[PDB]
Design a protein around this ligand. Structure first.
Ligand SMILES: CCCCCCCCCCCCCCCCCC(=O)OCC(COC(=O)CCCCCCCCCCCCCCCCC)OC(=O)CCCCCCCCCCCCCCCCC
Ligand code: HEA
Ligand code: HEA
Ligand SMILES: CCCCC/C=C/C/C=C/C/C=C\C/C=C/CCCC(=O)O[C@H](COC(=O)CCCCCCCCCCCCCCCCC)COP(=O)(O)OCCN
Ligand SMILES: CCCCC/C=C\C/C=C/C/C=C/C/C=C\CCCC(=O)O[C@H](COC(=O)CCCCCCCCCCCCCCCCC)COP(=O)(O)OCCN
Ligand SMILES: CCCCCC/C=C/CCCCCCCCCC(=O)O[C@H](COC(=O)CCCCCCCCCCCCCCC)COP(=O)(O)OC[C@@H](O)CO
Ligand SMILES: CCCCCC/C=C\CCCCCCCCCC(=O)O[C@H](COC(=O)CCCCCCCCCCCCCCC)COP(=O)(O)OC[C@@H](O)CO
Ligand SMILES: CCCCCC/C=C\CCCCCCCCCC(=O)O[C@H](COC(=O)CCCCCCCCCCCCCCC)COP(=O)(O)OC[C@@H](O)CO
Ligand SMILES: CCCCCCCCCCO[C@@H]1O[C@H](CO)[C@@H](O[C@H]2O[C@H](CO)[C@@H](O)[C@H](O)[C@H]2O)[C@H](O)[C@H]1O
Ligand SMILES: CCCCCCCCCCO[C@@H]1O[C@H](CO)[C@@H](O[C@H]2O[C@H](CO)[C@@H](O)[C@H](O)[C@H]2O)[C@H](O)[C@H]1O
Ligand SMILES: CCCCCCCCCCO[C@@H]1O[C@H](CO)[C@@H](O[C@H]2O[C@H](CO)[C@@H](O)[C@H](O)[C@H]2O)[C@H](O)[C@H]1O
Ligand SMILES: CCCCCCCCCCO[C@@H]1O[C@H](CO)[C@@H](O[C@H]2O[C@H](CO)[C@@H](O)[C@H](O)[C@H]2O)[C@H](O)[C@H]1O
Ligand SMILES: C[C@H](CCC(=O)O)[C@H]1CC[C@H]2[C@@H]3[C@H](O)C[C@@H]4C[C@H](O)CC[C@]4(C)[C@H]3C[C@H](O)[C@]12C
Ligand SMILES: C[C@H](CCC(=O)O)[C@H]1CC[C@H]2[C@@H]3[C@H](O)C[C@@H]4C[C@H](O)CC[C@]4(C)[C@H]3C[C@H](O)[C@]12C
Ligand code: CUA
Ligand SMILES: [Cu+2]
Ligand SMILES: [Mg+2]
Ligand code: NA
Ligand SMILES: [O-]
Ligand SMILES: [Zn+2]
Lengths: 84, 43, 227, 58, 98, 46, 259, 514, 79
């Protein structure tokens, strides 16, 4: 494997807590580092009104029927381009 | 199989009524609708 | 086309449809044989007061009930598969014609040389000419050269349709966003009829297909005439 | 917290012939009644809407 | 260190669970969890079939691996025989372990 | 307990064969009629 | 009176209130989708909560309080839950088929490429990797919880289960943030469609499974579980592993290979 | 008492009773729809309107016959009644969840009826293919109500499959191995597995159709890079297993009926019968694209699906031959039930053989979307599924009711139905070979004789359906109470009397290990 | 070269019933070739065989939509 420890063989609860605090949560802490460093808002792309995107065959059943459910003005253009 | 004689026998007359009532419950309502199709298509 | 009280397939117009007739005869013989054998054995089992109700050992006999059906499946599969790969094998078409299915009619495009395209609609019953067939005639027939390998491409610009000509053994679904290939070769001049073979709404029953198979020279002059 | 399961075992084994869904006492009844009222009322509103939707409008 | 705090079945199991658990500790099967082991099934040595009434349905797998099970009611009284193999069974009524 | 035995393990009465005939006739009748009245309903539209 | 170990259940209204809830939610979505009203839907959602609450309450009443869960009843519930999870796996299988169908033969409308022209996929090495680490961790922490409960250790069980839930909730808050921040939407062709509907159903399963775990947490608080009888905890741990594994398949397929 | 018993049930027998009642009512709705179909085609021209109203009728016919009549009768009805009794179990594993399986079905049926009442209905076929089923060619609530009806039917059968599997695995006598369970129980366990694996895939498909119609997804829309053929795959992945689901409990009941009225203690080749049903269950998951031979699939795929579809004939033949071997040397009782069963063996064989014709992708090019498919599936559904349901009903009515039917009336009913169904569907073969398309409200003039005879046959079947209702009334009306049943030693379901008590096997059976 | 053109010949890259990509490929190849010529002032004429294949195979409505989108700047293929 891409894995090499030894068999912990001394009551299961103690071993799994060992793994929780020894491996599991440290991994979550490193990946939390790696993510709250590669984050920060980024160059939004030129709006091109491609026909395979911003699909509208029926209005959405909320708002003005033209905004998706988790609409972000910054990064989600409407079919007519980004909002003012 | 074996069974007791009918506790409430259903005579020929009684069967004729039940069979008649049964057929009429299927045929009258469908018959009404099918007979009046033209009147539906116009309205 | 079909005629009144018809039992079997429309007469073969291509060699592939001819091959399908012979393969259907082979299969149907097997079907009649087996279904008649089952009926016969049912009646055999039901026609004796003689009895044997004690435990019957079921091993020697299950060999026969398994190997014989396996042989018969093989006797069907062989010819079935010869014809499948024969249908598919590389020929070289002299001509390519597209048909687009619509609600509810077919458009045809012959675009090898000129920009030839037109719409093909069912003749309404109230405007049939003497001798014309209810539900089957079209205003503009699909003229094609007889005795020639033609590539039909099938699609739709709306819902599913399916382009079918039973005489030539043809059915190709017409799917929007997709281009389905089939090949067509009439051994004979004539008129060859078919109907929309996928439910497509209000007039699914009423968007038929008429091929007119004539010599190449009449085909060429027709094409020129339709530009 | 303390383990009060034994009490609950006593309550729910009490030989009063109540079904398990009502055996906790008066709240089970209140809650059951609220649930049935919403379900049956909601169904009647559902049939009204079907009716309404079955005929054309503006 | 396990600090405890988690009840055992012994302490907290109740109702039928508790009955099954206590009966099993004593090697008893009042709730028919286990397949009974056959006797020789002669009239001398009949299969003893416990019941809380005066009849109980028996199913007889006459030979090992028979797919067919022979079902019949066994009544309080003289040993009855399987209609297929004649293996003898005798009802042993008691009152229910409440 | 609940009633057991013939005519008592059902959600309809068979106490009177004429009341029963009325029930069975409404029951199967309403089922068979439904489509005809849906076809009607759709034809009396547009 | 019975001499078998199986559970004859008291006549219950909850199956009826379940069915009617199903009717009210399905007819409610129709009214929402087509007649611009949420009232029917809100009612079916409410009755459905009430039904689930009272149904599962009664199961706790039948088991912890009444003792109806003999080993034979427990075996049955194990089979029940395995079979439920199998049915959920086939459900997701449909969405994976849809994903693999669209992504392996991108159509001309997309630019004949995957990802489609105009789609800027999320970086799988950012929050997706974090999310992967979070569910895998919660997998370790739920196993610690299981062993704690079997070893009679109340405190460490409540501790391990709290951590598992916190990771569940973390994953859900991250996925909500990714959803808000994603430059593509459900309406961005088959990429948006497969992405949001597959990861969206996953997200619901994470919320469902987190909820189950929280139920298990409060029951443990009230001492319902013995060191040897805790099927509710096992069922929630099986469900939770299922959720974990569906995530690994989404990460490998949609976020990594599909980017 | 009445609500506690009939709305709040946790009893396997009562819930089976609810299912039979629901099934019988659906059968009436389905029969009416079949008569509208055959009224429209009974003479050349237009009777009702264009293809939309017609195909709403055709669509509803199918949904009702499949999801509201056959599945509820065979699995909900005979299943809940017989399976617990046949393994000496006190009830099902999840008796309360069992009740919700039942009460989901009325609302499911309400949603189907709503779809047909709202706008112009769902004229889509039971396959509900996009783009016709889509929000442009089927704008409005009709298709969404259809999708939600299938969702509720789906959940009903998935929870029921979990129930039957758990029950049959876990609640047999300790000494009973799976190889000591009767074939009906095998047939329900295998059916429940197909349901568990197939329905969630359909749920995924129709949910994707729901989102394409209402949330601007493009799973099946080429504009967004989608494919209408994807839906066909997801649907048929369920759809073929669905047909084996419709027949397997049928196979089970036929094995019991043939065994019983042959005066045999057991069916011939028990393990061969188990093997055959399991092979059919397995093989039924790897053949779905035989519904897709004309969509434009590569030749090698066509050759696999041809071959995998055909192999199903072998295990199916072992069941057929094994039923004939059960008859062999029997002391034959020519009961009405036996007549239904004998009709089944022959007419199912015919339907199956025309299935084998359709398996050959080459022939299927010409037969696909024609009345030859319609003849195939009505032989195995209107003369297979239905004949097995009628045989079982006649056989077990006395167990369920405590009353006997008039045997003469029942023989009369069989005879009318037999003529009716054969007159309706035999000529549809001819219509198919000669090219009559499916889902047509009207045909070219040449097709007129076979359509006329077929419609006349549909009316003979109406007369049988109406007679059936009278026969059931006559039985409840007359109250001939059952005394004695032969062969209880190999039919455990009869052994607690007719009807059996509300609670059976409170004391489990005694079965020892030797 | 081979300009006794009847129709698009068999192309082993696209040997099955679905011919969508065959159309699309030859449509891309032509407009690519076209671009790499109005560039170096060369002759479109070398691009002719792609023009003839895509015109033979492609639905008119497809070509029309593809052409409208090249003009609009929404054509999703690389040219
Ligand atoms: C015949 C009308 C019957 C209608 C009755 C319907 C009512 C229901 C009751 C029903 C009463 C039954 C009527 C007899 C059956 C006749 C079938 C037949 O000739 O069918 C022929 C073919 C079509 O093939 C052809 O095309 C070639 C035949 C050419 C005809 C010969 C010359 C006759 C001259 C007139 C015709 C035109 C000739 C030129 C045309 C050239 C051909 C293209 O059709 C087919 O495939 C049909 C599809 C068959 C699939 C089912 C499998 C068989 C199961 C039953 C077997 C049980 C055995 C009992 C064993 C027997 C026990 C008694
Ligand atoms: C089980 C399924 C089933 C059954 C029984 C039937 C029965 C019948 N069907 Fe149906 N049919 C379908 C399923 C079924 N059908 C399907 C799936 C399609 C394709 C749909 C599509 O294209 O989208 C179809 C299509 C179809 C067409 C083609 C429509 C078209 O292509 O334009 C026609 C035309 O004749 C037809 C006719 C009939 C007739 C006359 C009967 C008669 O035989 C019916 C006679 C009456 C009965 C058999 C009654 C049964 C009632 C009971 C058993 C209740 C009793 C209950 C108890 C005693 C408990 N059917
Ligand atoms: C009960 C329902 C049921 C059953 C059991 C079957 C069983 C089979 N079906 Fe069918 N089928 C349907 C219901 C059913 N079907 C429906 C509803 C449709 C259409 C759906 C729609 O489009 O709306 C359909 C459609 C359908 C098609 C598509 C046709 C088309 O649309 O172009 C095909 C193609 O392969 C097919 C094949 C088969 C085969 C090979 C069997 C086999 O399982 C049959 C096997 C049985 C036998 C072979 C007879 C017994 C065997 C012997 C006596 C031994 C010897 C036999 C030989 C050696 C051959 N079916
Ligand atoms: C959004 C993310 C969500 C995650 C949230 C997580 C929060 C968890 C909270 C942690 C608090 C835990 C414990 C505090 C004290 C409670 C008393 C219970 C402990 C107990 O009773 O046990 C003691 C353990 O102490 C010992 O040394 C062992 C002590 C082990 C526990 C404390 C250490 C845990 C710290 C985890 C940090 C991980 C991050 C890594 C960053 C660094 C990168 C390399 C003594 O036992 P023992 O003989 O040593 O071993 C026998 C087994 N008990
Ligand atoms: C982060 C975890 C999510 C928590 C959930 C919280 C809120 C509501 C969401 C419900 C989850 C449902 C899952 C599957 C259904 C549809 C996809 C929803 C996935 C989702 O949430 O997708 C969002 C769209 O939601 C939309 O439109 C849809 C809005 C909601 C509409 C409800 C749809 C109901 C239809 C489903 C029927 C269920 C059928 C199941 C059958 C059962 C088995 C037989 C994505 O946002 P966007 O703005 O497009 O892009 C982001 C741009 N910045
Ligand atoms: C099995 C994987 C198949 C992948 C390709 C097979 C063979 C290829 C050879 C080389 C292998 C790697 C390269 C990939 C090739 C891509 C193939 C492809 O392109 O396949 C695409 C579909 O794939 C799809 O989603 C496929 C998805 C179909 C799923 C089948 C159903 C499985 C369900 C089982 C459920 C149990 C799950 C248990 C949980 C673990 C589309 O096909 P096209 O090209 O448009 O046209 C060919 C057609 O005629 C096919 O009949
Ligand atoms: C928008 C609407 C969506 C829904 C919103 C939220 C819905 C659900 C939230 C999660 C629900 C979980 C709650 C279940 C708790 C039940 C109680 C329980 O866990 O019951 C246990 C039995 O398990 C049992 O029935 C096992 C119980 C199985 C439950 C399975 C739960 C998952 C299914 C939820 C619905 C899935 C929907 C899928 C969506 C497509 C009780 O036995 P034990 O634990 O051994 O205790 C006995 C000891 O005390 C004796 O010593
Ligand atoms: C778009 C809108 C569509 C919405 C339709 C939804 C339909 C209905 C909604 C209402 C249903 C929720 C109500 C609670 C159901 C609880 C089920 C349950 O927990 O059932 C258990 C059995 O199944 C088990 O274990 C394990 C099985 C647990 C199943 C949990 C409920 C499933 C609901 C969703 C179904 C999804 C199907 C899969 C495909 C996605 C318990 O069996 P009982 O017979 O009760 O008791 C037996 C006693 O011995 C216990 O002491
Ligand atoms: C990338 C992988 C992601 C991991 C996600 C979580 C994996 C869950 C695996 C299944 O759970 C455990 O498997 C171990 C089987 O090896 C057992 O451990 C325990 O077994 C003994 C119990 O006494 C102890 O001695 C040992 O130390 C201890 O490892 C334990 O029974 C079991 O619950
Ligand atoms: C399997 C489980 C599936 C069930 C899925 C549950 C879906 C939940 C939908 C929640 O919808 C939100 O609620 C708001 C209000 O409470 C909406 O206001 C909307 O709706 C009103 C309709 O009356 C309009 O008047 C408003 O203007 C309009 O913004 C809002 O926008 C919408 O996001
Ligand atoms: C699809 C399967 C069912 C088809 C077969 C059923 C047909 C059997 C006839 C049953 O029904 C009746 O026929 C009458 C005609 O004989 C109709 O009366 C109509 O005609 C009468 C006289 O001809 C007038 O007096 C009435 O007012 C007028 O309603 C009557 O409404 C209709 O119910
Ligand atoms: C006990 C369980 C049963 C409780 C009884 C059921 C309660 C029935 C309320 C009936 O009122 C409905 O309210 C809808 C909204 O709530 C209205 O739609 C409205 O929806 C929007 C308001 O949110 C408006 O903007 C729209 O114009 C309008 O169509 C609609 O006219 C009306 O039928
Ligand atoms: C071995 C198994 C069960 C035997 C038992 O334990 O009773 C039996 C049951 C059904 C049998 C199969 C069926 O008889 C069908 C086939 C018949 C052929 O004679 C051999 C292969 C064949 C596939 C058999 C192999 C084997 O004998 C099977 C699989
Ligand atoms: C209250 C109880 C101690 C007494 C008893 O066991 O009943 C302890 C045991 C474990 C504790 C919990 C766990 O340690 C996990 C959490 C730790 C957080 O720091 C506080 C809340 C938190 C959720 C704790 C709340 C509470 O103090 C708990 C539940
Ligand atoms: Cu076009 Cu049917
Ligand atoms: Cu199939
Ligand atoms: Mg088709
Ligand atoms: Na007509
Ligand atoms: O089939
Ligand atoms: Zn014996």
């Amino acid at each position: 494997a891409s894995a090499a420890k030894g068999d912990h063989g001394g009551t299961g609860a103690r071993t799994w807590r060992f793994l929780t605090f020894g491996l599991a949560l440290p991994s979550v802490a490193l990946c939390t580092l790696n993510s709250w460093l590669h984050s920060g808002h980024r160059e939004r792309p030129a709006f091109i009104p491609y026909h395979h995107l911003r699909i509208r065959t029926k209005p959405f059943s909320w708002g003005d029927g033209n905004h998706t459910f988790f609409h972000n003005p910054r990064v989600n253009p409407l079919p007519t381009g980004y909002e003012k | 199989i074996t069974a007791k004689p009918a506790k409430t026998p259903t005579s020929p007359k009684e069967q004729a009524i039940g069979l008649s009532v049964t057929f009429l419950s299927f045929l009258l309502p469908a018959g009404w609708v099918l007979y009046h199709l033209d009147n539906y298509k116009k309205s | 086309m079909a005629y009144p009280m018809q039992l079997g397939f429309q007469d073969a117009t291509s060699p592939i449809m001819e091959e399908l007739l012979h393969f259907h005869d082979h299969t149907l013989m097997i079907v009649f044989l087996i279904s008649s054998l089952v009926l016969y054995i049912i009646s055999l089992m039901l026609t004796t007061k003689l009895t044997h109700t004690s435990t019957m050992d079921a091993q020697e006999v299950e060999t026969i009930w398994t190997i014989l059906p396996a042989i018969i499946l093989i006797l069907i599969a062989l010819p079935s598969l010869r014809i499948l790969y024969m249908m598919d094998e590389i020929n070289n078409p002299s001509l390519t014609v597209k048909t687009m299915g619509h609600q509810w009619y077919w458009s045809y495009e012959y675009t090898d040389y000129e920009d030839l395209s037109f719409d093909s609609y069912m003749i309404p019953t109230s405007e049939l000419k003497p001798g014309e067939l209810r539900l089957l005639e079209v205003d503009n027939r699909v003229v094609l050269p007889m005795e020639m390998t033609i590539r039909m491409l099938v699609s739709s610009e709306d819902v599913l349709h399916s382009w079918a000509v039973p005489s030539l053994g043809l059915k190709t679904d017409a799917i929007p966003g997709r281009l389905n290939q089939t090949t067509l070769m009439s051994s004979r001049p004539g008129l060859y009829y078919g109907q929309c073979s996928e439910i497509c709404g209000s007039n699914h029953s009423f968007m038929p297909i008429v091929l007119e198979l004539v010599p190449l020279k009449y085909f060429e002059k027709w094409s020129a005439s339709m530009l | 917290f303390e383990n009060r399961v034994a009490e609950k075992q006593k309550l729910f084994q009490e030989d009063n012939g109540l079904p398990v869904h009502l055996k906790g006492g008066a709240t089970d009844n209140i809650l059951y009644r609220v649930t049935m009222t919403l379900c049956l009322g909601g169904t009647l509103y559902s049939l009204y809407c079907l009716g309404w939707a079955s005929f054309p409008h503006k | 260190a396990s600090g405890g705090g988690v009840p055992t079945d012994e302490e907290q199991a109740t109702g039928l669970e508790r009955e099954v658990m206590l009966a099993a500790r004593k090697g008893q099967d009042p709730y028919n969890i286990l397949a009974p082991k056959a006797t020789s099934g002669t009239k001398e040595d009949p299969n003893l079939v416990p019941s809380i009434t005066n009849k109980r349905i028996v199913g007889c797998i006459c030979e090992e691996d028979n797919s067919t099970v022979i079902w019949f009611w066994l009544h309080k009284g003289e040993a009855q025989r399987c209609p297929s193999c004649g293996t003898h069974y005798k009802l042993v009524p008691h009152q229910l372990a409440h | 307990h609940y009633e057991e035995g013939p005519g008592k393990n059902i959600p309809f009465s068979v106490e009177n064969k004429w009341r029963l005939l009325a029930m069975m006739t409404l029951f199967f009748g309403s089922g068979f009629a439904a489509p005809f009245f849906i076809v009607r309903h759709q034809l009396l539209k547009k | 009176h019975q001499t078998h170990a199986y559970h004859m259940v008291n006549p219950s209204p909850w199956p009826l209130t379940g069915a009617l809830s199903a009717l009210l939610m399905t007819s409610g979505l129709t009214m929402w989708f087509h007649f611009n009203s949420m009232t029917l839907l809100m009612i079916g959602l409410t009755t459905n909560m009430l039904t689930m609450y009272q149904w599962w309450r009664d199961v706790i009443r039948e088991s912890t309080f009444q003792g109806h869960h003999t080993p034979a009843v427990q075996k049955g519930l194990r089979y029940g839950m395995i079979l439920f999870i199998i049915s959920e796996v086939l459900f997701f299988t449909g969405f994976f088929w849809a994903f693999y169908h669209s992504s392996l033969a991108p159509t001309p409308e997309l630019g004949g490429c995957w990802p489609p022209t105009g789609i800027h996929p999320l970086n799988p090495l950012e929050v997706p990797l974090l999310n992967t680490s979070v569910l895998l961790a919660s997998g370790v922490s739920i196993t610690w919880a299981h062993h704690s409960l079997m070893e009679g250790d109340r405190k460490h069980m409540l501790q391990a289960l709290f951590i598992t839930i916190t990771l569940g909730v973390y994953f859900t808050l991250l996925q909500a943030s990714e959803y808000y921040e994603a430059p593509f939407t459900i309406s961005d062709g088959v990429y948006g469609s497969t992405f949001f509907v597959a990861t969206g159903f996953h997200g619901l399963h994470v919320i469902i499974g987190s909820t189950f775990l929280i139920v298990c947490f409060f029951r443990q608080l009230k001492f319902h579980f013995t060191s040897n009888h805790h099927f509710g905890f096992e069922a929630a741990a099986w469900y939770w592993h299922f959720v974990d594994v569906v995530w690994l398949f989404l990460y490998v397929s949609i976020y990594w290979w599909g980017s | 008492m009445f609500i506690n018993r009939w709305l709040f049930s946790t009893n396997h027998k009562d819930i089976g009773t609810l299912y039979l009642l629901f099934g019988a009512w659906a059968g009436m709705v389905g029969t009416a729809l079949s008569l509208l179909i055959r009224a429209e085609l009974g003479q050349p021209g237009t009777l009702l309107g264009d293809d939309q109203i017609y195909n709403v009728v055709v669509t509803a016919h199918a949904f009702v016959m499949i999801f509201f009549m056959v599945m509820p009768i065979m699995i909900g009805g005979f299943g809940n009644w017989l399976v617990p009794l046949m393994i000496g179990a006190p009830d099902m594993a999840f008796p309360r969840m069992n009740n919700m399986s039942f009460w989901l079905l009325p609302p499911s049926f309400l949603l189907l009826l709503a779809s047909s009442m709202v706008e112009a209905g769902a004229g889509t076929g039971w396959t509900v293919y996009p783009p016709l089923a889509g929000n442009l060619a089927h704008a409005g609530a009709s298709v969404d109500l259809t999708i939600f009806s299938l969702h509720l039917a789906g959940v009903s059968s998935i929870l029921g499959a979990i129930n039957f599997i758990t029950t049959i695995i876990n609640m047999k006598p300790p000494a009973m191995s799976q190889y000591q369970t009767p074939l009906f129980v095998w047939s329900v366990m295998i059916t429940a597995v197909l349901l568990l694996l197939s329905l969630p895939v359909l749920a995924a498909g129709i949910t994707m159709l729901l989102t394409d119609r209402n949330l601007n997804t493009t799973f099946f829309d080429p504009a967004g890079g989608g494919d209408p053929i994807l839906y066909q795959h997801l649907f048929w992945f369920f759809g073929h297993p669905e047909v084996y689901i419709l027949i397997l409990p049928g196979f089970g009941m036929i094995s019991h009926i043939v065994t019983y009225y042959s005066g045999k203690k057991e069916p011939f080749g028990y393990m061969g019968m188990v093997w055959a049903m399991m092979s059919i269950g397995f093989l039924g998951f790897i053949v779905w694209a035989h519904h897709m031979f004309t969509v434009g699939m590569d030749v090698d795929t066509r050759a696999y699906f041809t071959s995998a579809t055909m192999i199903i004939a072998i295990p199916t033949g072992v069941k057929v031959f094994s039923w004939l071997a059960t008859l062999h040397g029997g002391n034959i009782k020519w009961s009405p039930a036996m007549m239904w069963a004998l009709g089944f063996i022959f007419l199912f064989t015919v339907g199956g053989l025309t299935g084998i014709v359709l398996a050959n992708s080459s022939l299927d090019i010409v037969l696909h979307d024609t009345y030859y498919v319609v003849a195939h599936f009505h032989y195995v559904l209107s003369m297979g599924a239905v004949f097995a349901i009628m045989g079982g009903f006649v056989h077990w009515f006395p167990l369920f009711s405590g009353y006997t039917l008039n045997d003469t009336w029942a023989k009369i009913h069989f005879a009318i139905m037999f003529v009716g169904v054969n007159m309706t569907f035999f000529p549809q073969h001819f219509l198919g070979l000669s090219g009559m398309p499916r889902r047509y409200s009207d045909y070219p003039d040449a097709y007129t004789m076979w359509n006329t005879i077929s419609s006349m046959g549909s009316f003979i079947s109406l007369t049988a359906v109406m007679l059936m209702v009278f026969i059931i009334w006559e039985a409840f009306a007359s109250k001939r109470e059952v005394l004695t049943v032969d062969l209880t030693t190999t039919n455990l379901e009869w052994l607690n009397g007719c009807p059996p008590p509300y609670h059976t096997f409170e004391e489990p059976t005694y079965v020892n290990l030797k | 070269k081979i300009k006794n053109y009847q129709t698009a010949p068999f192309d082993s890259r696209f040997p099955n019933q679905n011919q969508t990509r065959n159309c699309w490929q030859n449509y891309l190849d032509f407009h690519r070739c076209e671009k790499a010529m109005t560039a170096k002032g060369g002759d479109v004429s070398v691009c002719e065989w792609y023009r003839r294949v895509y015109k033979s195979l492609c639905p008119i409505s497809w070509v029309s939509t593809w052409d409208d989108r090249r003009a609009e700047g929404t054509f999703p293929g690389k040219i």
